[PDB]
Amino acid sequence: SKRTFQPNNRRRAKTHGFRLRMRTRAGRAILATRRSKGRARLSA
Amino acid sequence: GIRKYKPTTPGRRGSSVADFVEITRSTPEKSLVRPLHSKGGRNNTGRVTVRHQGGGHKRAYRVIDFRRHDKDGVPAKVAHIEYDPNRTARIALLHYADGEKRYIIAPRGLSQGDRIENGPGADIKPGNNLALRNIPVGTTIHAIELRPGGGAKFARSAGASVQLLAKEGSMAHLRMPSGEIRLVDVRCRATIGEVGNAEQSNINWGKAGRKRWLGVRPTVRGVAMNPVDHPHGGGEGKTSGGRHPVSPWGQKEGRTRSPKKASNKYIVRRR
RNA sequence: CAGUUUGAUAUUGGUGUAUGUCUAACCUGGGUCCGUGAUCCGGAUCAGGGACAGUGUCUGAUGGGUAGUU
RNA sequence: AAACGUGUGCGCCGAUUGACUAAGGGUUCCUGGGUCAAGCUGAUCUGCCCAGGGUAAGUCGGGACCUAAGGCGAGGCCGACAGGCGUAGUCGAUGGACAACCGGUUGAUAUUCCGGUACCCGCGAUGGGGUGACGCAGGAAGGUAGUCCAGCCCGGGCGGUGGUUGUCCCGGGGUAAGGGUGUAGGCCGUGUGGUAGGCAAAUCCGUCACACGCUGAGACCUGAUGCCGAGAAGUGGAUGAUCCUAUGCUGUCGAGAAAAGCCUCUAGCGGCCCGUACCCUAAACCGACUCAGGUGGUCAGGUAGAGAAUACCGAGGCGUUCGGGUGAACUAUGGUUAAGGAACUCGGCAAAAUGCCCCCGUAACUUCGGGAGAAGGGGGGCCACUUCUGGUGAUCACUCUUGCAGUGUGAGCUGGGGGUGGCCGCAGAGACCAGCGAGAAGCGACUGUUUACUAAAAACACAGGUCCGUGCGAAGCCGUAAGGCGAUGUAUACGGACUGACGCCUGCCCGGUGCUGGAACGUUAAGGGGACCGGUUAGCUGAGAACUUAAGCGCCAGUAAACGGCUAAGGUAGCGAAAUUCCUUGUCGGGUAAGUUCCGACCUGCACGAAUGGCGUAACGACUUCUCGACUGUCUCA
RNA sequence: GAGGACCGAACCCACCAGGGUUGAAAACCUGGGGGAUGACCUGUGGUUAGGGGUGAAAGGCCAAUCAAACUCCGUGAU
């Protein structure tokens, strides 16, 4: 039937986007703790 | 009046609808309409705080003049009587002799073409607006201000009527539609006559859909729920709750007016 | 324990016979004006309420609404 | 070389196995080369590997224009900190405003390039006013796109086999945006004066007194001496839309965005950025797969048919993605079965049977709508003659207001209806498609919702009923607070609780618990008070009684459509072996040859009962139970 | 020419049966079946978050997981 992942780039940048991560201080820790861990793609 | 639907489908049987003989125009006055979107019973945090609301037909809000304080001595004519989805009583469009247009609640007996005037010199006829100090004792009024210039608060729905019982100094005794007797400052304004469309309460909606159009969503009984959801829930088979009736949040039945509330000293007799 | 609630006390004053009255603290989600293009906010100014209410500390009552467990 | 290419044939899809678009994918598109990895076999082929190439915009979609739900938010409010809310503003299309069509071309792009002809951008406000500006349903009319036919026009052909120079056969009978014109349809009073209102003004809007043209499908011309076309003709008629007139018209209640833009009033030679390939009912997206699943929107031909169903076909596409044989048992999907016809079984589960249009006819009961397509019965093909009747509209005249008119006239074309006779077959709704019907009981009034992935129900909901709370900064609810919803609502309104259409009704109990009201009096915390008794050598200091006080509780009344019960009162009305009855397969009657089930009664109610409603109820039900007719491989029995 | 009207495709759903059950599919296929102008279905954009949301109420749903989601941490819990 209908699976649980219908891709939509707009709605995936307004939910996990970098701009959204920088808005809440709880989200800027996620960004920083990914920079320290060394990941390449730092935010969706 | 009320028109009874011929029983022709299972849903329509036993229903009725307002006959709308009163209204003279079907469209509103463009300059006096404002946008209005349904809230769905959810406050600024997005959570439902009022249950059983939302999904109704789209509506637009008519700007009504509940104050009627700045047109003293200016006559007006009742141009039309119109339907209002926002409230039970009809609304009447006034053409003031100075050229301005406004809406008011439709008092009983107000008909198209009637002349009505505000201010202390207005005659005591349905539609006129006066300060309580100028209305004879024993008159029936509606749309009563609570504070000087505060706008109409009381007796605003269909068929509501308030009887002025006495005037004592700077206060006036009012018999509210609920039967409560209350003191009100004698400078508050009120309109003569009782609100019209008194047959509204006799309408039988007939089918579940007709309420849904009004925006009333289904109401679920507690005794059908589970104990986690409602205090009455649970039990095998049908139960009456197993406890003294309470709201879903555990509050018992009982009087909830704040006993220290300031307005008590304006209350002569409760309903 | 949250919540609801009682009293004392601080904010809290004048004046008369537990209870009146006054205005000045305090409250108006009352009117009008300005910042100002502005239903938020603040400052004016009239209109009221008024040492009451709200709030802090202390205190009795209720408290499966919630929480920890037998 | 079964699979790669070309040709022929055959079959399949065709409201899609065709042609596009958004989302998504991200080079899978084209050329050339390869066959090691991948392809559920194979490969010279590939959506695979390597190299190279390919996406052209003033007019298409979006940005530089507007705003909705909502987000962020200068100051700001609130909050121990973190942080929550929010004003001015600023973002945010799924909507509004805004200028291009036809044809050709490459291997890969085309409303983007090319050809032709077009179009838009380069005094007056941000303030006022008008407009923008709006639901749902329904029919009719006028048109067009498309389609069909033709004895007509143009181009071909004379039939491998009986006949085909003939109302015989095959193929084609087009052309857009823009401009000119202004029809059918729809809408609309003009002007003078005064003018408390539109934050200032207004000659504009509104209000008062007085006197008395706009838009618009389409037809025609131009665009077009062009382009297209089997380089000819490029006409006429019929039919006809889900498309246009139409944001129209009529009806109706549930009463149906904002801003920009445009108009008006006063105050005072250039034309930018992103997308443009390719897939898109799928072999390129979501499902781990080249997955029998899912995926919004547009295009929509012929014959039969009411139809976008269904059968065969068109435009166009596919037959590649393991094959070749062989009558084993057995399994699955289809098919037919003599005589019997539910005897199978928990149960008619499954299958069978009915099935279409027209006409006749239709019961109990009923809330008068219904039941009802009740049940049941008749006609159905083709040919000829005959009879009646729509639409269209040339020609013929006449009339005007002299036109894109009108009114008579009826050729040709084309629906529809009724009789008479005849012909063929086993069969005329001949294929595909296409209701089984009846009687009774239980529950729920009804349409609906529900346990995504074993329960669709008698469960939830519902319209209706009662009770309780709320006087507006309402009650209730989210939040520590601010602030919000309730509500731009106001006792005929809102919230909470139970019952659940409709009809007749809803009995007794306030002793318990809860709720409402009253508090004389008893008890009672903090606080006030500090009697009196101690330590030390009047002072300091420890413990500290009497007395003073509120809620609450004890107490007094009411309240059961409050939780509850039937001494506080002991079950009324109604029903009753029941969705309840153990004993129990109670007893009697009916149904059957035989009835632990079913229907009607009795009443010994283990253990019914009145809004956790009692008793009934027309209609309804993929609900449960019993019976009967039709029908059948369910069964004898395969 | 009204209707939470009737029959019936698209669309939504899932009552019955058979198949599938290391399936073509971690819920589908075939034939019947219900609604099919409304309390309807659907696209795009928003929004409600864990003792919390939402719920025509099944403890249902909240990313194949729900009588309290998932991830990291206390943590090498017991």
PDB file of all heavy atoms in Angstrom, chain E residues 53-63:
ATOM      1  P     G E  53      -2.526  15.979  26.142  1.00  0.00           P
ATOM      2  OP1   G E  53      -3.383  17.122  26.530  1.00  0.00           O
ATOM      3  OP2   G E  53      -2.932  14.607  26.524  1.00  0.00           O
ATOM      4  O5'   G E  53      -2.343  16.010  24.562  1.00  0.00           O
ATOM      5  C5'   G E  53      -1.769  17.134  23.907  1.00  0.00           C
ATOM      6  C4'   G E  53      -1.457  16.827  22.466  1.00  0.00           C
ATOM      7  O4'   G E  53      -0.565  15.689  22.404  1.00  0.00           O
ATOM      8  C3'   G E  53      -2.643  16.428  21.604  1.00  0.00           C
ATOM      9  O3'   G E  53      -3.322  17.551  21.073  1.00  0.00           O
ATOM     10  C2'   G E  53      -2.014  15.551  20.530  1.00  0.00           C
ATOM     11  O2'   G E  53      -1.454  16.343  19.497  1.00  0.00           O
ATOM     12  C1'   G E  53      -0.878  14.882  21.295  1.00  0.00           C
ATOM     13  N9    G E  53      -1.197  13.531  21.786  1.00  0.00           N
ATOM     14  C8    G E  53      -1.186  13.171  23.105  1.00  0.00           C
ATOM     15  N7    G E  53      -1.452  11.915  23.302  1.00  0.00           N
ATOM     16  C5    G E  53      -1.640  11.409  22.032  1.00  0.00           C
ATOM     17  C6    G E  53      -1.956  10.094  21.634  1.00  0.00           C
ATOM     18  O6    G E  53      -2.134   9.108  22.350  1.00  0.00           O
ATOM     19  N1    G E  53      -2.056   9.993  20.259  1.00  0.00           N
ATOM     20  C2    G E  53      -1.878  11.025  19.375  1.00  0.00           C
ATOM     21  N2    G E  53      -2.020  10.724  18.080  1.00  0.00           N
ATOM     22  N3    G E  53      -1.580  12.263  19.739  1.00  0.00           N
ATOM     23  C4    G E  53      -1.475  12.385  21.078  1.00  0.00           C
ATOM     24  P     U E  54      -4.917  17.670  21.179  1.00  0.00           P
ATOM     25  OP1   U E  54      -5.286  18.989  20.615  1.00  0.00           O
ATOM     26  OP2   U E  54      -5.324  17.311  22.556  1.00  0.00           O
ATOM     27  O5'   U E  54      -5.462  16.537  20.208  1.00  0.00           O
ATOM     28  C5'   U E  54      -5.340  16.662  18.800  1.00  0.00           C
ATOM     29  C4'   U E  54      -5.655  15.364  18.105  1.00  0.00           C
ATOM     30  O4'   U E  54      -4.692  14.356  18.496  1.00  0.00           O
ATOM     31  C3'   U E  54      -6.996  14.739  18.440  1.00  0.00           C
ATOM     32  O3'   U E  54      -8.070  15.307  17.716  1.00  0.00           O
ATOM     33  C2'   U E  54      -6.763  13.270  18.129  1.00  0.00           C
ATOM     34  O2'   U E  54      -6.833  13.022  16.734  1.00  0.00           O
ATOM     35  C1'   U E  54      -5.320  13.096  18.582  1.00  0.00           C
ATOM     36  N1    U E  54      -5.224  12.623  19.977  1.00  0.00           N
ATOM     37  C2    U E  54      -5.309  11.272  20.191  1.00  0.00           C
ATOM     38  O2    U E  54      -5.468  10.479  19.288  1.00  0.00           O
ATOM     39  N3    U E  54      -5.205  10.884  21.495  1.00  0.00           N
ATOM     40  C4    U E  54      -5.025  11.704  22.582  1.00  0.00           C
ATOM     41  O4    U E  54      -4.947  11.210  23.703  1.00  0.00           O
ATOM     42  C5    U E  54      -4.946  13.095  22.283  1.00  0.00           C
ATOM     43  C6    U E  54      -5.046  13.494  21.016  1.00  0.00           C
ATOM     44  P     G E  55      -9.563  15.211  18.293  1.00  0.00           P
ATOM     45  OP1   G E  55     -10.467  15.892  17.339  1.00  0.00           O
ATOM     46  OP2   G E  55      -9.524  15.631  19.711  1.00  0.00           O
ATOM     47  O5'   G E  55      -9.891  13.657  18.260  1.00  0.00           O
ATOM     48  C5'   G E  55      -9.973  12.946  17.035  1.00  0.00           C
ATOM     49  C4'   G E  55     -10.096  11.462  17.275  1.00  0.00           C
ATOM     50  O4'   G E  55      -8.952  11.005  18.041  1.00  0.00           O
ATOM     51  C3'   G E  55     -11.298  11.028  18.099  1.00  0.00           C
ATOM     52  O3'   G E  55     -12.472  10.880  17.320  1.00  0.00           O
ATOM     53  C2'   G E  55     -10.823   9.728  18.731  1.00  0.00           C
ATOM     54  O2'   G E  55     -10.919   8.652  17.814  1.00  0.00           O
ATOM     55  C1'   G E  55      -9.350  10.032  18.980  1.00  0.00           C
ATOM     56  N9    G E  55      -9.104  10.574  20.329  1.00  0.00           N
ATOM     57  C8    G E  55      -9.038  11.899  20.662  1.00  0.00           C
ATOM     58  N7    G E  55      -8.798  12.110  21.922  1.00  0.00           N
ATOM     59  C5    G E  55      -8.698  10.842  22.458  1.00  0.00           C
ATOM     60  C6    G E  55      -8.450  10.446  23.791  1.00  0.00           C
ATOM     61  O6    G E  55      -8.262  11.158  24.781  1.00  0.00           O
ATOM     62  N1    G E  55      -8.428   9.070  23.917  1.00  0.00           N
ATOM     63  C2    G E  55      -8.622   8.189  22.893  1.00  0.00           C
ATOM     64  N2    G E  55      -8.559   6.900  23.233  1.00  0.00           N
ATOM     65  N3    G E  55      -8.857   8.539  21.642  1.00  0.00           N
ATOM     66  C4    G E  55      -8.884   9.879  21.495  1.00  0.00           C
ATOM     67  P     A E  56     -13.576  12.044  17.283  1.00  0.00           P
ATOM     68  OP1   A E  56     -13.347  12.856  16.065  1.00  0.00           O
ATOM     69  OP2   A E  56     -13.616  12.705  18.606  1.00  0.00           O
ATOM     70  O5'   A E  56     -14.942  11.260  17.095  1.00  0.00           O
ATOM     71  C5'   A E  56     -15.498  10.507  18.159  1.00  0.00           C
ATOM     72  C4'   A E  56     -16.578   9.582  17.665  1.00  0.00           C
ATOM     73  O4'   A E  56     -17.488  10.319  16.815  1.00  0.00           O
ATOM     74  C3'   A E  56     -16.119   8.419  16.801  1.00  0.00           C
ATOM     75  O3'   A E  56     -15.657   7.323  17.576  1.00  0.00           O
ATOM     76  C2'   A E  56     -17.359   8.099  15.980  1.00  0.00           C
ATOM     77  O2'   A E  56     -18.268   7.299  16.720  1.00  0.00           O
ATOM     78  C1'   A E  56     -17.974   9.485  15.787  1.00  0.00           C
ATOM     79  N9    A E  56     -17.631  10.091  14.489  1.00  0.00           N
ATOM     80  C8    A E  56     -16.605  10.952  14.220  1.00  0.00           C
ATOM     81  N7    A E  56     -16.552  11.336  12.971  1.00  0.00           N
ATOM     82  C5    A E  56     -17.620  10.687  12.380  1.00  0.00           C
ATOM     83  C6    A E  56     -18.105  10.680  11.067  1.00  0.00           C
ATOM     84  N6    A E  56     -17.545  11.374  10.078  1.00  0.00           N
ATOM     85  N1    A E  56     -19.187   9.927  10.801  1.00  0.00           N
ATOM     86  C2    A E  56     -19.740   9.238  11.801  1.00  0.00           C
ATOM     87  N3    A E  56     -19.376   9.165  13.074  1.00  0.00           N
ATOM     88  C4    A E  56     -18.295   9.922  13.302  1.00  0.00           C
ATOM     89  P     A E  57     -14.666   6.232  16.944  1.00  0.00           P
ATOM     90  OP1   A E  57     -13.542   6.931  16.282  1.00  0.00           O
ATOM     91  OP2   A E  57     -15.493   5.273  16.183  1.00  0.00           O
ATOM     92  O5'   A E  57     -14.090   5.450  18.205  1.00  0.00           O
ATOM     93  C5'   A E  57     -14.781   4.329  18.751  1.00  0.00           C
ATOM     94  C4'   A E  57     -14.272   3.980  20.129  1.00  0.00           C
ATOM     95  O4'   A E  57     -13.364   5.022  20.572  1.00  0.00           O
ATOM     96  C3'   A E  57     -15.344   3.872  21.205  1.00  0.00           C
ATOM     97  O3'   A E  57     -14.961   2.906  22.178  1.00  0.00           O
ATOM     98  C2'   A E  57     -15.332   5.262  21.827  1.00  0.00           C
ATOM     99  O2'   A E  57     -15.822   5.318  23.148  1.00  0.00           O
ATOM    100  C1'   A E  57     -13.850   5.613  21.761  1.00  0.00           C
ATOM    101  N9    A E  57     -13.587   7.048  21.688  1.00  0.00           N
ATOM    102  C8    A E  57     -13.943   7.885  20.671  1.00  0.00           C
ATOM    103  N7    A E  57     -13.577   9.126  20.857  1.00  0.00           N
ATOM    104  C5    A E  57     -12.931   9.101  22.078  1.00  0.00           C
ATOM    105  C6    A E  57     -12.315  10.105  22.834  1.00  0.00           C
ATOM    106  N6    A E  57     -12.249  11.377  22.447  1.00  0.00           N
ATOM    107  N1    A E  57     -11.762   9.756  24.008  1.00  0.00           N
ATOM    108  C2    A E  57     -11.831   8.477  24.383  1.00  0.00           C
ATOM    109  N3    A E  57     -12.387   7.444  23.763  1.00  0.00           N
ATOM    110  C4    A E  57     -12.923   7.827  22.599  1.00  0.00           C
ATOM    111  P     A E  58     -15.394   1.372  22.013  1.00  0.00           P
ATOM    112  OP1   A E  58     -16.695   1.310  21.316  1.00  0.00           O
ATOM    113  OP2   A E  58     -15.239   0.719  23.333  1.00  0.00           O
ATOM    114  O5'   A E  58     -14.296   0.779  21.032  1.00  0.00           O
ATOM    115  C5'   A E  58     -14.159  -0.618  20.846  1.00  0.00           C
ATOM    116  C4'   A E  58     -12.735  -0.987  20.519  1.00  0.00           C
ATOM    117  O4'   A E  58     -12.314  -0.302  19.314  1.00  0.00           O
ATOM    118  C3'   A E  58     -11.689  -0.591  21.543  1.00  0.00           C
ATOM    119  O3'   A E  58     -11.636  -1.478  22.647  1.00  0.00           O
ATOM    120  C2'   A E  58     -10.415  -0.566  20.710  1.00  0.00           C
ATOM    121  O2'   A E  58      -9.928  -1.881  20.494  1.00  0.00           O
ATOM    122  C1'   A E  58     -10.933  -0.019  19.382  1.00  0.00           C
ATOM    123  N9    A E  58     -10.735   1.436  19.218  1.00  0.00           N
ATOM    124  C8    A E  58     -10.816   2.094  18.023  1.00  0.00           C
ATOM    125  N7    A E  58     -10.612   3.381  18.089  1.00  0.00           N
ATOM    126  C5    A E  58     -10.383   3.598  19.430  1.00  0.00           C
ATOM    127  C6    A E  58     -10.105   4.769  20.143  1.00  0.00           C
ATOM    128  N6    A E  58     -10.014   5.969  19.575  1.00  0.00           N
ATOM    129  N1    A E  58      -9.924   4.669  21.469  1.00  0.00           N
ATOM    130  C2    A E  58     -10.022   3.466  22.029  1.00  0.00           C
ATOM    131  N3    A E  58     -10.282   2.295  21.465  1.00  0.00           N
ATOM    132  C4    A E  58     -10.458   2.419  20.144  1.00  0.00           C
ATOM    133  P     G E  59     -11.443  -0.899  24.130  1.00  0.00           P
ATOM    134  OP1   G E  59     -11.327  -2.042  25.068  1.00  0.00           O
ATOM    135  OP2   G E  59     -12.467   0.143  24.371  1.00  0.00           O
ATOM    136  O5'   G E  59     -10.021  -0.201  24.066  1.00  0.00           O
ATOM    137  C5'   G E  59      -8.854  -0.991  23.929  1.00  0.00           C
ATOM    138  C4'   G E  59      -7.682  -0.180  23.449  1.00  0.00           C
ATOM    139  O4'   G E  59      -7.650   1.051  24.213  1.00  0.00           O
ATOM    140  C3'   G E  59      -6.313  -0.810  23.682  1.00  0.00           C
ATOM    141  O3'   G E  59      -5.861  -1.716  22.673  1.00  0.00           O
ATOM    142  C2'   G E  59      -5.401   0.399  23.845  1.00  0.00           C
ATOM    143  O2'   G E  59      -5.001   0.913  22.585  1.00  0.00           O
ATOM    144  C1'   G E  59      -6.325   1.406  24.521  1.00  0.00           C
ATOM    145  N9    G E  59      -6.175   1.423  25.988  1.00  0.00           N
ATOM    146  C8    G E  59      -6.988   0.804  26.900  1.00  0.00           C
ATOM    147  N7    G E  59      -6.623   0.999  28.135  1.00  0.00           N
ATOM    148  C5    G E  59      -5.502   1.805  28.032  1.00  0.00           C
ATOM    149  C6    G E  59      -4.673   2.342  29.040  1.00  0.00           C
ATOM    150  O6    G E  59      -4.770   2.213  30.262  1.00  0.00           O
ATOM    151  N1    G E  59      -3.644   3.103  28.511  1.00  0.00           N
ATOM    152  C2    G E  59      -3.439   3.318  27.178  1.00  0.00           C
ATOM    153  N2    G E  59      -2.388   4.086  26.863  1.00  0.00           N
ATOM    154  N3    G E  59      -4.204   2.823  26.223  1.00  0.00           N
ATOM    155  C4    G E  59      -5.212   2.078  26.718  1.00  0.00           C
ATOM    156  P     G E  60      -6.724  -2.148  21.383  1.00  0.00           P
ATOM    157  OP1   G E  60      -8.035  -2.708  21.752  1.00  0.00           O
ATOM    158  OP2   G E  60      -5.836  -3.008  20.571  1.00  0.00           O
ATOM    159  O5'   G E  60      -6.904  -0.811  20.547  1.00  0.00           O
ATOM    160  C5'   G E  60      -5.829  -0.296  19.781  1.00  0.00           C
ATOM    161  C4'   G E  60      -6.299   0.641  18.703  1.00  0.00           C
ATOM    162  O4'   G E  60      -7.175   1.637  19.272  1.00  0.00           O
ATOM    163  C3'   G E  60      -5.210   1.451  18.032  1.00  0.00           C
ATOM    164  O3'   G E  60      -4.535   0.722  17.028  1.00  0.00           O
ATOM    165  C2'   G E  60      -5.963   2.665  17.508  1.00  0.00           C
ATOM    166  O2'   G E  60      -6.617   2.373  16.283  1.00  0.00           O
ATOM    167  C1'   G E  60      -7.023   2.860  18.586  1.00  0.00           C
ATOM    168  N9    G E  60      -6.691   3.916  19.557  1.00  0.00           N
ATOM    169  C8    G E  60      -6.488   3.780  20.905  1.00  0.00           C
ATOM    170  N7    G E  60      -6.249   4.911  21.503  1.00  0.00           N
ATOM    171  C5    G E  60      -6.315   5.849  20.487  1.00  0.00           C
ATOM    172  C6    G E  60      -6.142   7.248  20.519  1.00  0.00           C
ATOM    173  O6    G E  60      -5.888   7.968  21.485  1.00  0.00           O
ATOM    174  N1    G E  60      -6.294   7.813  19.264  1.00  0.00           N
ATOM    175  C2    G E  60      -6.575   7.123  18.120  1.00  0.00           C
ATOM    176  N2    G E  60      -6.682   7.845  17.001  1.00  0.00           N
ATOM    177  N3    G E  60      -6.739   5.817  18.073  1.00  0.00           N
ATOM    178  C4    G E  60      -6.595   5.252  19.285  1.00  0.00           C
ATOM    179  P     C E  61      -2.935   0.686  17.009  1.00  0.00           P
ATOM    180  OP1   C E  61      -2.521  -0.397  16.088  1.00  0.00           O
ATOM    181  OP2   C E  61      -2.456   0.691  18.409  1.00  0.00           O
ATOM    182  O5'   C E  61      -2.540   2.082  16.365  1.00  0.00           O
ATOM    183  C5'   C E  61      -3.013   2.435  15.077  1.00  0.00           C
ATOM    184  C4'   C E  61      -2.826   3.900  14.794  1.00  0.00           C
ATOM    185  O4'   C E  61      -3.773   4.689  15.561  1.00  0.00           O
ATOM    186  C3'   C E  61      -1.489   4.493  15.182  1.00  0.00           C
ATOM    187  O3'   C E  61      -0.432   4.159  14.307  1.00  0.00           O
ATOM    188  C2'   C E  61      -1.815   5.975  15.244  1.00  0.00           C
ATOM    189  O2'   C E  61      -1.952   6.530  13.946  1.00  0.00           O
ATOM    190  C1'   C E  61      -3.188   5.932  15.899  1.00  0.00           C
ATOM    191  N1    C E  61      -3.062   6.021  17.366  1.00  0.00           N
ATOM    192  C2    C E  61      -3.009   7.282  17.949  1.00  0.00           C
ATOM    193  O2    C E  61      -3.092   8.283  17.230  1.00  0.00           O
ATOM    194  N3    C E  61      -2.875   7.388  19.284  1.00  0.00           N
ATOM    195  C4    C E  61      -2.786   6.288  20.024  1.00  0.00           C
ATOM    196  N4    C E  61      -2.657   6.435  21.340  1.00  0.00           N
ATOM    197  C5    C E  61      -2.826   4.989  19.454  1.00  0.00           C
ATOM    198  C6    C E  61      -2.958   4.904  18.130  1.00  0.00           C
ATOM    199  P     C E  62       1.032   3.910  14.912  1.00  0.00           P
ATOM    200  OP1   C E  62       1.894   3.331  13.855  1.00  0.00           O
ATOM    201  OP2   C E  62       0.877   3.170  16.183  1.00  0.00           O
ATOM    202  O5'   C E  62       1.536   5.375  15.263  1.00  0.00           O
ATOM    203  C5'   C E  62       1.453   6.408  14.297  1.00  0.00           C
ATOM    204  C4'   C E  62       1.796   7.759  14.872  1.00  0.00           C
ATOM    205  O4'   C E  62       0.804   8.163  15.846  1.00  0.00           O
ATOM    206  C3'   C E  62       3.104   7.855  15.631  1.00  0.00           C
ATOM    207  O3'   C E  62       4.223   7.953  14.770  1.00  0.00           O
ATOM    208  C2'   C E  62       2.892   9.088  16.496  1.00  0.00           C
ATOM    209  O2'   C E  62       3.113  10.274  15.754  1.00  0.00           O
ATOM    210  C1'   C E  62       1.403   8.987  16.823  1.00  0.00           C
ATOM    211  N1    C E  62       1.147   8.416  18.161  1.00  0.00           N
ATOM    212  C2    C E  62       1.280   9.236  19.279  1.00  0.00           C
ATOM    213  O2    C E  62       1.620  10.410  19.104  1.00  0.00           O
ATOM    214  N3    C E  62       1.046   8.728  20.505  1.00  0.00           N
ATOM    215  C4    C E  62       0.686   7.455  20.632  1.00  0.00           C
ATOM    216  N4    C E  62       0.460   6.977  21.855  1.00  0.00           N
ATOM    217  C5    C E  62       0.536   6.601  19.510  1.00  0.00           C
ATOM    218  C6    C E  62       0.772   7.119  18.304  1.00  0.00           C
ATOM    219  P     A E  63       5.553   7.108  15.065  1.00  0.00           P
ATOM    220  OP1   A E  63       5.211   5.929  15.888  1.00  0.00           O
ATOM    221  OP2   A E  63       6.578   8.060  15.543  1.00  0.00           O
ATOM    222  O5'   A E  63       5.999   6.582  13.633  1.00  0.00           O
ATOM    223  C5'   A E  63       5.297   5.525  12.987  1.00  0.00           C
ATOM    224  C4'   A E  63       5.972   5.121  11.702  1.00  0.00           C
ATOM    225  O4'   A E  63       6.050   6.281  10.834  1.00  0.00           O
ATOM    226  C3'   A E  63       7.400   4.616  11.854  1.00  0.00           C
ATOM    227  O3'   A E  63       7.683   3.653  10.846  1.00  0.00           O
ATOM    228  C2'   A E  63       8.224   5.871  11.615  1.00  0.00           C
ATOM    229  O2'   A E  63       9.544   5.631  11.181  1.00  0.00           O
ATOM    230  C1'   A E  63       7.401   6.580  10.549  1.00  0.00           C
ATOM    231  N9    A E  63       7.550   8.033  10.557  1.00  0.00           N
ATOM    232  C8    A E  63       7.298   8.877  11.600  1.00  0.00           C
ATOM    233  N7    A E  63       7.514  10.134  11.320  1.00  0.00           N
ATOM    234  C5    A E  63       7.932  10.112  10.002  1.00  0.00           C
ATOM    235  C6    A E  63       8.320  11.125   9.120  1.00  0.00           C
ATOM    236  N6    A E  63       8.346  12.415   9.450  1.00  0.00           N
ATOM    237  N1    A E  63       8.684  10.763   7.875  1.00  0.00           N
ATOM    238  C2    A E  63       8.656   9.470   7.549  1.00  0.00           C
ATOM    239  N3    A E  63       8.314   8.425   8.290  1.00  0.00           N
ATOM    240  C4    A E  63       7.958   8.822   9.519  1.00  0.00           C
TER     241        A E  63
END
